[PDB]
Amino acid sequence: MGQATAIAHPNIAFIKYWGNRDAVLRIPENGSISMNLAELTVKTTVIFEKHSREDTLILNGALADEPALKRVSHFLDRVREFAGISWHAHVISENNFPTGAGIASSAAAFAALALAATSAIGLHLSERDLSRLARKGSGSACRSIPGGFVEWIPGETDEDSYAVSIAPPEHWALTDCIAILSTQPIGSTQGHALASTSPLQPARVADTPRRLEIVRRAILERDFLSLAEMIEHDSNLMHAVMMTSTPPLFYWEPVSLVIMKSVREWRESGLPCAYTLDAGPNVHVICPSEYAEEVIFRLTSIPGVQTVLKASAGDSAKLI
Amino acid sequence: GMGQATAIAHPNIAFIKYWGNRDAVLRIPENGSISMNLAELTVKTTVIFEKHSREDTLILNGALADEPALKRVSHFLDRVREFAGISWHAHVISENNFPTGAGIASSAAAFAALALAATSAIGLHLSERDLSRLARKGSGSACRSIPGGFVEWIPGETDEDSYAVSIAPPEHWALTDCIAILSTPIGSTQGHALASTSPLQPARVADTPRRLEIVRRAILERDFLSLAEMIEHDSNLMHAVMMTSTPPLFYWEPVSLVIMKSVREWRESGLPCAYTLDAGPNVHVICPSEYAEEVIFRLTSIPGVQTVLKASAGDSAKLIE
Ligand SMILES: C[C@@](O)(CCOP(=O)(O)O)CC(=O)O
Ligand SMILES: C[C@@](O)(CCOP(=O)(O)O)CC(=O)O
């Protein structure tokens, strides 16, 4: 009755999404900018079938838990509403993420699902509409629909909240050296909802355009130092909000702190690199790709760093 | 020998933090703060005004102070000289019992003791308010070591308006500060000035009355859980601002974070305690005193904790001998 397969990459936010204006629609409180990660992929096949009563979900070869299925089912309901078709679908998804490494899959997964599910049900959405749809699966998924360096235009409405590519992957050879911590959280959905308990979240949110403008310009101009200092600042602002929520969300591990301090010292001593952390203790170390081997060496030397994943700028979600 | 006096004062641990100045020179803070004096740590300072001294001299634990420390003390004594209308320079002899290398800041205790010894030596009989106001200009938090016990710094907007008062005497509430000294340090002065670079500082500052009102009530009501949750929140707010300054100030060490998480776990599992951190990695673990031995036992076992200092609520700065 209709089938398609799409791949999408996770992304690393240079300017973080944290907090929703609308939790249901995943309209964020602030805009965000990320880079897709080429070497990590979710591949998702959607198969719409005649009179399948309910949707099904398999994840990396295994029956998905009911939470995951429900979430994917509600998402497909949106694809059904948008398409006025009623078919239920079998969803098969796999990713190549290193096991236990704590790399969040939701952005890649809902980007791939948005593209596979709409293509399977016969639609031909623009990138913008795919981003808007993916967004409602998981906010950051909207940024994995476009390619390369991506900005989520936060908006106030479902139509207005979507992501676009600032620059293609080939515009700037940046590498994300992801320090995976051996010892290793509260999910994004709960965390976003808790942001409003932090006294500092409104101020963080209100300041986001300043930060976005710097990062956007830095990407366009390939100004690594400006990017570096702002991504650390923006990471720290998000974590500041997290840590001052009620209950506090302390995603950092002790080694996360060692890495953050080490990266700053490395940069200040001549090695261009910068850190950023999502809702977890892994440290993404962004650097011009020519420095990645040196960064990885230094990260690998830090006690407590299990392994370092090397990712370059990835393309948009694609059908295969 | 134109007048001499000796005073003692204790350092203090802020439950609601001072961070950022409205007026850096006068150490008028952006926000109010609340602290508890630490009985078991003391600075004892003798001030002897000398007709023959051309400049002040500062002796610390029997040794000549570094030049920066002398300059701070001499600038402070200039304020006393001005206030008193007297010219004399002084010998300042100070001792303290702080554990060596522990990173326990002495400046609040030092300037509280100096404010009291110096004014007493020079013939003045200042009210606590005026002593606090004076101590504040040596080091802001010293204004909180002038009064006793649990102390609130009224932030104010003027030199006359910024001073601390006792919320409650030490005996009002048996709380212990179990200070986890880490085995493995940008100064406050630079740090406060950088607070203005954090996008989050205005919001932290504007929220302080909410936090002060909770802690003040918690102290008056002996409500440990309310105190506990607010001191951790307040500590994290300050460190949030520090970590989001430009350049960032990351005072936490990895072990700091271990302790912070451990403390929250301990409290949630039924051991009443709460963490707070100043501008450094040591973790002050506040708890009702009946739990201190267990808190200390748990803290002592944490790798990277060099030692744990046990402090109870201390009295006001006092003249002695
Ligand atoms: C914490 C962070 O990863 C957002 C997570 O958002 P989501 O709800 O998992 O899409 C930050 C970011 O990616 O912008
Ligand atoms: C960081 C903190 O210790 C303030 C230090 O201030 P100062 O050293 O008196 O300038 C917090 C506080 O004690 O309120």
Pocket test for ligand 1, best of A24, A71, A140 (most atoms within 8 A of CB): A140
Strand partners, B114: none
Sequence-ordered strand ranges (E) for A144-267:
149-153, 162-167, 174-181
Between helix A66-83 and helix A127-137 the angle, nearest 10°, is 140
Amino acid present at B124 = L
Instruction: Locate the domains of chain A by residue range.
Output: 1-179, 180-320
Whether B109 lines ligand 2, by a CB cut-off of 6 Å, is no
d(CA A105, CA A183): 19
Strand partners, A43: A7, A94
User: Which residues of B fall within a CB distance of 8 Å from A246?
Assistant: 229, 233
Q: Hey, what are A208's tokens?
A: 């986001």
User: Which residues of A fall within a CB distance of 8 Å from B232?
Assistant: 248
DSSP code of B263? H
d(CA B156, CA B30): 8
Deposited experimental method: X-ray
* Cα within 13 Å of Cα(A204), Cβ side: 35
Q: Which residues contact A172 (CB under 8 A, 6 or more apart)?
A: A149, A219, A222, A313
By C-alpha distance, which of B241, B237, B240 is closest to B194?
B241
Nearest-CA residue for ligand 1 atom 5 is A188
Cα B153–chain centre separation:
11
d(CA A52, CA A49): 6
Q: Hey, what are A41's tokens?
A: 């992929």
Burial classification of residue A124, based on how many CB atoms lie within 10 Å of its CB (0-12 exposed, 13-18 middle, 19 or more buried) = exposed
Contact yes or no for B273/B291 (Cβ under 8 A): yes
CATH of A1-179, one of 3.30.360.10, 3.30.230.10, 3.40.640.10, 1.10.580.10: 3.30.230.10
Instruction: Please tell me whether residue B284 adopts helix, strand or coil conformation.
Output: strand
Query: Which H helix or E strand runs over A318?
Result: strand A318-319
Q: Which residues contact B316 (CB under 8 A, 6 or more apart)?
A: B9, B37, B128, B146, B147, B148, B149, B166
Contact yes or no for A236/A276 (Cβ under 8 A): no
User: Which residues of A fall within a CB distance of 8 Å from B236?
Assistant: 243-244, 248
User: Does the B1-180 domain belong in CATH 3.30.9.80?
Assistant: no
By C-alpha distance, which of A224, A251, A247, A219 is closest to A238?
A251
* Cα within 13 Å of Cα(A46), Cβ side: 32
DSSP code of B100? T
Instruction: Please tell me whether residue A213 adopts helix, strand or coil conformation.
Output: helix
Identify the residue among B236, B242, B253, B260 best suited for mutation to test binding to A, counting A beta carbons within 10 A and taking the highest.
Answer: B236
Between helix B107-121 and helix B128-138 the angle, nearest 10°, is 130
By C-alpha distance, which of A232, A195, A188, A193 is closest to A211?
A232
For residue B86, the tally of other CB atoms under 10 A from its CB is 14
Distance from CA of A70 to the nearest CA of B (A): 33
Q: Which residues contact B177 (CB under 8 A, 6 or more apart)?
A: B13, B36, B38, B284, B285, B286, B310, B311, B312
d(CA A225, CA A231): 10
Cα A73 to Cα A66, A88, B240, B307, distances in angstroms = 10, 9, 39, 55
Instruction: Please tell me whether residue A281 adopts helix, strand or coil conformation.
Output: coil
Q: Hey, what are B269's tokens?
A: 């599992």
Question: How many angstroms does the Cα of residue A163 sit away from the middle of ligand 1?
Answer: 14
Cα A290 to Cα A146, A226, A229, A286, A311, distances in angstroms = 25, 18, 19, 11, 13
For residue B320, the tally of other CB atoms under 10 A from its CB is 12
Contact yes or no for B27/B139 (Cβ under 8 A): yes
CA-based R_g, chain B, Å = 19
**Residue whose pair of structure tokens reads 């990712």 in the numeric block:** A311
DSSP code of B313? B
Contact yes or no for B23/B161 (Cβ under 8 A): no
Burial classification of residue A320, based on how many CB atoms lie within 10 Å of its CB (0-12 exposed, 13-18 middle, 19 or more buried) = exposed
d(CA A163, CA A36): 12
Nearest-CA residue for ligand 2 atom 8 is B188
Q: What angle do CA A211, A216, A217 make, to 5 degrees?
A: 100
d(CA B255, CA B182): 7
Residue in B237, B250, B253 nearest the CB of A199: B237
Amino acid present at B314 = G
